Design a protein around this ligand. Structure first.
Ligand code: PC1
Ligand code: PC1
Ligand code: 3PE
Ligand code: 3PE
Ligand code: 3PE
Ligand code: 3PE
Ligand code: 3PE
Ligand code: 3PE
Ligand code: 3PE
Ligand code: 3PE
Lengths: 140, 120, 347, 53, 459, 69, 50, 98, 101, 55
């Protein structure tokens, strides 16, 4: 999962929409596959068909969220000519939240996901710009 | 952190270097607070067993206070020793490495420049 | 159970823990672990009901899997280093296997699934012995091998443990399951601060041991295992309601109680190493532990739930249980914050 | 915690097994006695951080 | 500051060793003696603060708050002794003990030189108030009120602890006397933006800010009378003291990071006053009035000018006294009629004339009748906000009109009109209630003669 | 009032100076301790962060059964 | 005494004042050394303040 | 390194995946656990004998003794649950979900 | 059916019934009158009156009167010698090194 | 509309419902050892391959 994040962040922002979208979709699909694996492990399905349907549904939802977020953020960076700006990532996060609402087919969870994941994507953008460390190496 | 210090002479509560330090006074405020902790535990011991709290078993409350004072005195001795060791190691390492700890060129305020942000 | 056989078995448990603590050989660490587990199995099965045998079976399977993983890590380290001295490891695979073996033995998430069921199936005294004494040896082994521990793995285990423990304890009504999820969250905190300053880990371990011992001792003093039976305590002994109120407030880390000191010093240590997001996330997550603690205090001390008729028959008799060290750990778990600089004795 | 009971008490409970270059019965040498002896004579007394480099 | 701490902790053996009938007399007497003793803090100098020790100091901002706390404790002892009449003796002593402990934490909070000691005392104040509300409150939802209050405060305050520890590690000290001379500019970045948010949100929640005020019309309502008095009079001012102390480190990033909260608090006071216009509950109406006045204090602190600071501290003291008196009057009505509905008991001036006079005086000071210190604080904040921008005079004038409207609506509804026919248990006013009202009123009127002792450290 | 209850301005002045000197010394010592801890962690040549190694007093030096060792 | 409970608190205030004076004496490192109040000692005294 | 080491690691991994996925019986889990111990025995014995570490030759005996005592305890637990339920199925050990 | 066993709500006690001279402090008349005397003496006669007297005679609170006297002295001294009463710069420009640009 | 409906909706009620839903998902395990050990195997595989904790 380390090489997926580097290959997503190696592309300059607002430059290559297709490759950024593909990298975001791959990251989303990996996360959805992990979620589906734990789901079919702990909550066992009725049959093989129900389990593979749940796996496909979760993976497709997460991959669609990733693709929509990447495409929206890259397009907003292209249009505004502001590559280093967390507003583009906020727009992409709200687009991903609206996609999550569309997949689950309910408006309220979609709006809440728009707000919360737009804030989260903006925070990730600020951390990338300012060099915030989440798993900080021991120093003192 | 300090296991290299406490590695050549292991499992010692107070090494022989601790005796060069001033012992805590018996009127130490921390020691008095630990004695108050002992008194409070004695009162709780009276309370949970449905005894008169301030009257029953004065020997029990005295032993509570005495035990707390004893253990707290030795813990305070160890704490003071370990902070002394911390400072000693810090100063020895600062003195032994003068290249890494240069003297800061202090400047008066007539030479330094600070931006002014008006509040209006 | 014979008193003498019980004495011998308890000293065998402490002997296994001592053998793990004092030895410089990996095989002796393994030997102490199996001695401790083999001796502690009959403490779980003191009552001989199907729930105790089920809990003992799950505990045995989990500890045996963790022990085999530990032996695998030791053998890999011997293969790649040719020695057995308990110190930093010479292989990342051996370090990963040993870290996950110690995580399985501690019951940290996602290996946490055995802790609440095992704690529920066994008596209160054996559950106290488990959740207090069984965690001294894996944390000592972790304290000995910190130069080889992967930072990402241990931090992931820590944050997962804290979140899963809080979310799990939100839903429980049995007291033993609440104590188990609380334990999971606290081990998350302890192994979170492990790689930066292990003295903070020792301080958090000591404070958690004292607070858990106080809460379990109050539970066996009142013979309560559910929320409602604990809520009946106001009509039997209100001093115990005051004690459980102050101890549960201190367990949530509310200042100026002694439970504030571990997370305060942990946040102090984590910000020195330029890690700011994780201590904020762990504090916000520990608010959930505070939530179900406060729910318990609402049901027990700050309201008067309806009682029954036979409480009068219980009024006419005094208690005779040996509430050993209960006032001492009640005082030491609430009014220890002014003695915070005492943590320098643990370095 | 690693309570060094053996060094405090002077007993030798598991140090004889702890390395391959130690005192072996009938003076039987190991295959890598010399290399291990040289590595130990390096790493002694300088800590793990200095001995790793 | 040990000459006030030690008698406060000696109040505890006084209430735990008194007779079954002499606990109120002893506690009230000795708390009044310590309140008289608290006047020795007025040895303030024009250049230097009164620095007692390494841990304690008291400048001209913390001194009025200290005197207010130490004077407020015997008022709560006098107020809370009628509804605790039939209570068990041990529970009565526990109630008095929680009041004593809260006063101890409050007087250790305002004098803390170190910022982390201020934080520790400021969050130690949570436990006695939560216990008082959730134990001696009368309603069902006192538990929900306690949960809301506790979790709003802790969710606001944990990032403050993280940011204070960061400031300690970066600057080297949290001593307020050191930080006055060692302060550095805070540049514009995202890191400093979240520093400002972390340092400010705890006191924005505790004040409260509009939008974070949802815990106030619950904790102020389901509490007992002493709890409501100590929540309205002192506990809202911990946020004001915190923003006055912590704004020193947050420059010059405050000048643009203060815009959204200035718009929240300028529009928020209009919303809360309009809410006050249509309230069926008297206690909730007083709580929302408190929200509006603390929004005024928030704006005054955020624009950070000398006139705004003087108006903010004067308004804090004045609103504490006025809100305490209003809560006491509402409690007396509640003891008479056993309901908090404002429309139930009407026309009480024909039955309770001197209580109606006390109601009129409290209402007059609520709408800032000059030359009360209410009007002095409100006027100074209005002048400073006019200096900030000119349309603030439009907002302030609208707020003043609605404030007069709801205060006189309170008075006209409760006291005037035709009395309720079927209510016949309206007893004459006791000497205790009248003494409580006069002890709230007379310091408030006397402070208009010498208003210079409540105008902050930059008078 | 100023003779009985209040304190002299000189006393408060010099007391504040003493407090400021003590607290500035404490802050400088805290910063120096942070820098020392960082340097000792990075280099490993100081008395702190001395992780243990194999003790060389355990090595057998007597002649073995095989010369090539 | 039959009214010792009425003298618990004033002796607490007196003891707190005494501890305040003791600590003020403890913080006397810059007595008669400040650049604003430095002066020669008048005879028949040894310190500027106590 | 050598090849028989790779085969013993793969045998240990196979027995571990067998233990970590129960089918029906507790006895199959115990058999997978004891196969894991046997693979540990073979690996450690081969390493010690090839390295000519003379004093380490006592380790596999102690390992065998301790893990066989473990297996005796596990067999006793299996017999107890079989006496409780009439079979050693792992789906009957689900009372502690509540 | 009939619900759980619980006492009904007790009737409110009128303090003026058994004691028409009540101040509302306590049910015992002696404790009540002594509480009234304590509150009225130590609240109004002691704290309010002597507190107002103490605040009224504060020894030059925050040096305002001294500042006025010193301003009078400085204005007289500067007016006598033709000096400007106040300068635009608080510190001397001679002892200030501006950054070179 | 604002403080009785919406200001109550955004901050406290949505957060409370989210924590309630997460708690109900976490604690809904079926109490089977086989599923727990399958989850352990999945965790080991994810850490070894997808997360590279053995490097
Ligand atoms: C009552 C409800 C509302 C509560 C609101 C509370 C405040 C909101 C913002 C809090 C942010 C978290 C604390 C930040 C402390 C920053 C200290 C600092 O040094 O900052 C600079 C540091 C900078 O890192 P550094 O200082 O290590 O690096 C050195 C400096 N540079 C970058 C130049 C190299 O900032 C950070 O490390 C990250 C700050 C942002 C953190 C974002 C995650 C939290 C998001 C908000 C959560 C709010 C509560 C949510 C839960 C509510 C209840 C359910
Ligand atoms: C202080 C912060 C905490 C706040 C809460 C405190 C609670 C505890 C209370 C403790 C005691 C009270 C403390 C504050 C006391 C304030 C009062 C005080 O001391 O003032 C000093 C002030 C001091 O005034 P001064 O400063 O001008 O005096 C000069 C100073 N000396 C005396 C040294 C020369 O006292 C007065 O102003 C008294 C003046 C004389 C009396 C009044 C005469 C006129 C009265 C009205 C006449 C009619 C007018 C028209 C009416 C029409 C109808 C309405
Ligand atoms: C896209 C392909 C997805 C394949 C994985 C899911 C397969 C699945 O759901 O299998 C069902 C099985 C439970 O089978 P069940 O029918 O309950 O058994 C009774 C006898 N029929 O469920 C299981 O066996 C659970 C474990 C399945 C494997 C999980 C790990 C691999 C797949 C996810 C990561 C890639
Ligand atoms: C927008 C919209 O149409 O939301 C409707 C949606 C519920 O959908 P429904 O109306 O049932 O079809 O409702 C939702 O999705 C929930 C509400 C949407 C977000 C509203 C945000 C502003 C609320 C006021 C904030 C005040 C401060
Ligand atoms: C509430 C939640 C708040 C979260 C705040 C996160 C702050 C940012 C931390 C992650 C990040 O973006 O780090 C930046 C980093 C790129 O910078 P750098 O560390 O130099 O990476 C090159 C490798 N040496 O990026 C990386 O190292 C890889 C990217 C990490 C992305 C983490 C978040 C993924 C999406 C959410 C899950
Ligand atoms: C009350 C405490 C009584 C202690 C009796 C003496 C026991 C003893 O000898 O302890 C030695 C130990 C310090 O030994 P050391 O090897 O330096 O520490 C390694 C820890 N990582 O000493 C200590 O750790 C002192 C602190 C012990 C506290 C135990 C209770 C908490
Ligand atoms: C760096 C740190 C290194 C290590 C430092 C030292 C760590 C000490 C850890 C202590 C762990 C305690 C474990 C639990 C208690 C052990 C004793 C025991 O077996 O107690 C249970 C026993 C069962 O008897 P039974 O009659 O069946 O009880 C059922 C109720 N009728 O008896 C009972 O139930 C009797 C009822 C009372 C039991 C009270 C037990 C209190 C034990 C904890 C004391 C406080 C913690 C130790 C001191 C501080 C250490 C930091
Ligand atoms: C809900 C209850 C009622 C309300 C309670 C209080 C809620 C609000 C509290 C927080 C308000 C937001 C934070 C303060 C913003 C002040 C203005 C500001 O600085 O905005 C940041 C930015 C301005 O743009 P710029 O100046 O280019 O930023 C570069 C800075 N280095 O702005 C932008 O670029 C646009 C926005 C981008 C995303 C910002 C996300 C972080 C801030 C919110 C968290
Ligand atoms: C990916 C993670 C697993 C990696 C090894 C996979 C081996 C092949 C397994 C395919 C799936 C078979 C299956 O469904 O196993 C479930 C079974 C327990 O389920 P049971 O009760 O027997 O029947 C219900 C069936 N759904 O469980 C079993 O039968 C477990 C048998 C495990 C045998 C492993 C053999 C070695 C595999 C290669 C080396 C690793
Ligand atoms: C601005 C700040 C906004 C957030 C403030 C904190 C959350 C809101 C206030 C506390 C919770 C309020 C409450 O009582 O919610 C009720 C709800 C259900 O409660 P329930 O247990 O069903 O009721 C008992 C019997 N009536 O309770 C629940 O569903 C439990 C919710 C627990 C949330 C605890 C706080 C967690 C914060 C960190 C999250 C990560």
């Amino acid at each position: 999962a380390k090489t997926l994040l580097h290959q997503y962040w190696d592309i300059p922002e607002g430059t290559e929409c297709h490759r950024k979208t593909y990298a975001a979709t791959s990251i989303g699909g990996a996360s959805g596959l992990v979620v589906s694996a734990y789901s079919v492990a702990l909550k066992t399905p009725t049959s093989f068909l129900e389990g593979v349907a749940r796996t496909g549904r979760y993976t497709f939802t997460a991959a669609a969220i990733g693709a929509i977020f990447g495409l929206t953020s890259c397009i907003s960076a292209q249009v505004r000519e502001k590559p280093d700006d967390p507003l583009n990532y906020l727009i992409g996060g709200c687009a991903g939240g609206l996609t999550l609402g569309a997949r689950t087919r309910s408006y309220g969870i979609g709006a809440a996901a728009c707000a919360y994941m737009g804030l989260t994507a903006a925070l990730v953008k600020m951390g990338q710009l300012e060099g915030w460390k989440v798993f900080a190496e021991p120093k003192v | 952190m300090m296991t290299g210090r406490q590695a050549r002479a292991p499992l010692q509560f107070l090494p022989d270097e601790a005796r060069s330090l001033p012992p805590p006074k018996l009127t130490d405020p921390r020691l008095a607070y630990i004695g108050f902790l002992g008194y409070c535990s004695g009162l709780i011991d009276n309370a949970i067993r449905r005894r008169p709290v301030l009257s029953a078993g004065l020997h029990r409350q005295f032993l509570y206070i005495t035990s707390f004072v004893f253990v707290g005195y030795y813990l305070l001795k160890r704490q003071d020793y370990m902070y002394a060791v911390r400072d000693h190691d810090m100063f020895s390492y600062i003195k032994s490495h003068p290249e890494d700890f240069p003297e800061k060129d202090k400047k008066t305020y007539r030479e330094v420049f600070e931006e002014f942000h008006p509040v209006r | 159970m014979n008193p003498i056989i019980l004495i011998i078995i308890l000293m065998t448990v402490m002997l296994g823990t001592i053998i793990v603590m004092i030895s410089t050989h990996w095989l002796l660490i393994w030997i102490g672990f199996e001695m401790n587990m083999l001796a502690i199995i009959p403490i779980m099965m003191k009552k001989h009901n199907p729930r105790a045998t089920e809990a003992s079976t799950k505990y045995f399977l989990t500890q045996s899997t963790a022990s085999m993983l530990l032996m695998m890590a030791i053998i890999i380290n011997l293969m790649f280093s040719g020695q057995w001295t308990v110190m930093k490891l010479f292989n990342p695979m051996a370090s990963m296997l040993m870290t996950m073996a110690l995580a399985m033995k501690l019951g940290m998430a996602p290996f946490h699934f055995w802790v609440p069921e095992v704690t529920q199936g066994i008596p209160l005294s054996s559950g106290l012995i488990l959740l207090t004494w069984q965690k001294l040896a894996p944390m000592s082994v972790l304290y000995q091998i910190l130069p080889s521990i992967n930072l990402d793995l241990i931090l992931t285990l820590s944050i997962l443990s804290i979140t899963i423990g809080g979310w799990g304890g939100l839903n429980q009504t049995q007291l033993r399951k609440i104590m188990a999820y609380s334990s999971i969250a606290h081990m998350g905190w302890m192994t979170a601060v492990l790689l930066y300053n292990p003295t903070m880990t020792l301080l958090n371990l000591i404070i958690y041991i004292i607070m858990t011992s106080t809460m379990f001792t109050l539970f066996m003093a009142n013979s309560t295992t559910t929320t409602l039976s604990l809520s009946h305590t106001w009509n039997k002994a209100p001093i115990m309601t005051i004690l459980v109120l102050i101890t549960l407030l201190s367990m949530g880390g509310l200042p100026p109680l002694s439970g504030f000191m571990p997370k305060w010093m942990i946040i102090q240590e984590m910000t020195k190493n330029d890690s700011i997001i994780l201590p904020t996330l762990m504090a916000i997550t520990a608010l959930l532990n505070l939530y179900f603690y406060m729910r318990l205090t609402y049901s027990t001390a700050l309201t008067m739930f309806p009682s029954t008729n036979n409480m009068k028959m219980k009024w006419q008799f005094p208690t005779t249980k040996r509430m050993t060290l209960l006032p001492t750990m009640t005082v030491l778990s609430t009014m220890l914050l002014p003695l915070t600089p005492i943590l320098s004795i643990l370095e | 915690p690693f309570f060094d009971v053996q060094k405090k008490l002077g007993v030798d409970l598991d140090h004889w097994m702890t390395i391959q270059s130690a005192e072996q019965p009938h003076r039987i040498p190991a295959r890598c006695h010399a290399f291990e002896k040289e590595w130990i004579e390096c790493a002694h007394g300088i800590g793990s951080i200095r001995a790793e480099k | 500051m040990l000459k006030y701490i030690i008698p406060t902790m000696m109040l505890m053996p006084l209430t735990w060793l008194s007779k079954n009938s002499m606990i109120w007399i002893n506690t009230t007497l000795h708390s009044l003696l310590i309140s008289l003793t608290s006047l020795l803090l007025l040895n303030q100098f024009g250049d230097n603060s009164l620095n007692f020790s390494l841990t304690f100091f008291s400048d001209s901002l913390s001194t009025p708050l200290l005197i207010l706390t130490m004077w407020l404790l015997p008022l709560m002892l006098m107020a809370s002794q009628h509804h605790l009449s039939k209570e068990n003796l041990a529970r009565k002593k526990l109630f008095i003990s929680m009041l004593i402990l809260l006063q101890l934490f409050l007087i250790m909070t305002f004098t803390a030189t170190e910022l982390i000691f201020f934080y520790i005392m400021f969050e130690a104040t949570l436990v006695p108030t939560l216990i008082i509300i959730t134990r001696w409150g009368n309603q069902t939802e006192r538990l929900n009120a306690g949960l809301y209050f506790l979790f709003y405060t802790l969710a606001g305050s944990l990032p403050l602890l993280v940011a204070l520890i960061y400031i300690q590690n970066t600057m080297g000290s949290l001593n307020f006397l050191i930080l006055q001379y060692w302060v550095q500019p805070m540049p514009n970045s995202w890191s400093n933006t979240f520093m400002w948010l972390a340092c400010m949100m705890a006191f924005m929640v505790k004040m409260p800010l509009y939008g974070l005020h949802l815990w106030l019309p619950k904790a102020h309502v389901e509490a007992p009378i002493a709890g409501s008095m100590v929540l309205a009079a002192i506990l809202l001012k911990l946020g004001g003291y915190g923003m006055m102390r912590i704004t020193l480190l947050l420059n010059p990033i405050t000048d643009f990071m203060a815009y959204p909260f200035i718009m929240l608090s300028l529009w928020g006071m209009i919303m809360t006053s309009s809410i006050c216009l249509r309230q069926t509950d008297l206690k909730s109406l007083i709580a929302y009035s408190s929200v509006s006045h603390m929004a005024l204090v928030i704006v005054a602190i955020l624009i950070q000018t000398p006139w705004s600071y003087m108006g903010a501290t004067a308004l804090m003291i004045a609103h504490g006294l006025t809100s305490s008196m209003l809560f006491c009057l509402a409690n007396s009505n509640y003891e008479r009629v056993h309901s908090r509905t404002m429309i139930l008991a009407r026309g009480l001036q024909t039955l309770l004339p001197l209580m109606a006079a006390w109601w009129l005086l409290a209402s007059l000071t609520n709408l800032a009748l000059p030359p009360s210190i209410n009007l002095i604080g409100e006027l100074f904040v209005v002048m400073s906000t006019f200096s900030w921008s000119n349309i603030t005079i439009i907002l302030m004038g609208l707020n003043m009109v609605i404030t007069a409207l709801y205060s006189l609506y309170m008075l006209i509804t409760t006291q005037r009109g035709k009395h309720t026919h079927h209510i016949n248990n309206i007893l004459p006013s006791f000497t205790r209630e009248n003494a409580l009202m006069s002890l709230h009123m007379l310091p408030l009127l006397l402070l208009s003669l010498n208003p210079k002792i409540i105008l902050g450290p930059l008078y | 009032i100023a003779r009985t209850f209040f304190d002299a301005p000189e006393k408060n002045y010099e007391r504040t100076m003493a407090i400021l000197q003590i607290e500035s010394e404490k802050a400088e010592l805290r910063l120096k301790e942070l820098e020392v801890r960082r340097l000792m962690r990075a280099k490993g040549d100081g008395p702190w962060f001395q992780y243990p190694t194999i003790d060389k007093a355990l090595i057998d030096h007597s002649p073995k059964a095989t010369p090539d060792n | 005494r039959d009214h010792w409970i009425h003298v618990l608190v004033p002796v607490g205030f007196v003891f707190g004042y005494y501890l305040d004076r003791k600590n003020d004496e403890k913080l006397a490192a810059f007595r008669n050394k400040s650049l604003l109040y430095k002066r020669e000692l008048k005879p028949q005294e040894e310190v500027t303040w106590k | 390194m050598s090849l028989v080491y790779m085969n013993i690691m793969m045998a240990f991994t196979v027995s571990l995946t067998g233990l970590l996925m129960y089918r029906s019986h507790l006895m199959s889990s115990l058999l997978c656990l004891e196969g894991m111990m046997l693979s540990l025995f073979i690996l450690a014995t081969l390493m010690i004998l090839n390295s000519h570490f003379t004093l380490a030759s006592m380790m596999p005996i102690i390992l065998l003794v301790f893990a066989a005592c473990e297996a005796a305890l596990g067999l006793s637990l299996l017999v107890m649950v079989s006496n409780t339920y009439g079979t050693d199925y792992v789906q009957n050990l689900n009372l502690l979900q509540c | 059916t009939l619900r759980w066993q619980e006492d009904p709500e007790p009737e409110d006690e009128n303090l003026y019934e058994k004691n028409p001279d009540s101040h509302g402090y306590d049910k015992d008349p002696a404790v009540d009158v002594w509480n009234m005397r304590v509150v009225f003496f130590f609240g109004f006669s002691i704290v309010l009156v002597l507190g107002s007297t103490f605040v009224a005679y504060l020894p030059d609170y925050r040096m305002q009167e001294w500042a006025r006297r010193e301003a009078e002295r400085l204005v007289k001294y500067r007016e006598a010698h033709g000096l400007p009463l106040m300068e635009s710069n608080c510190f001397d420009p001679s002892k200030i090194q501006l950054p070179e640009d | 509309l604002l403080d009785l409906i919406w200001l109550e909706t955004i901050l406290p009620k949505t957060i409370s419902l989210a924590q309630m839903k997460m708690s109900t998902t976490i604690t809904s395990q079926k109490g089977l050892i086989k599923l727990y050990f399958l989850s352990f195997l999945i965790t080991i595989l994810i850490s070894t391959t997808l997360l590279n904790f053995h490097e």
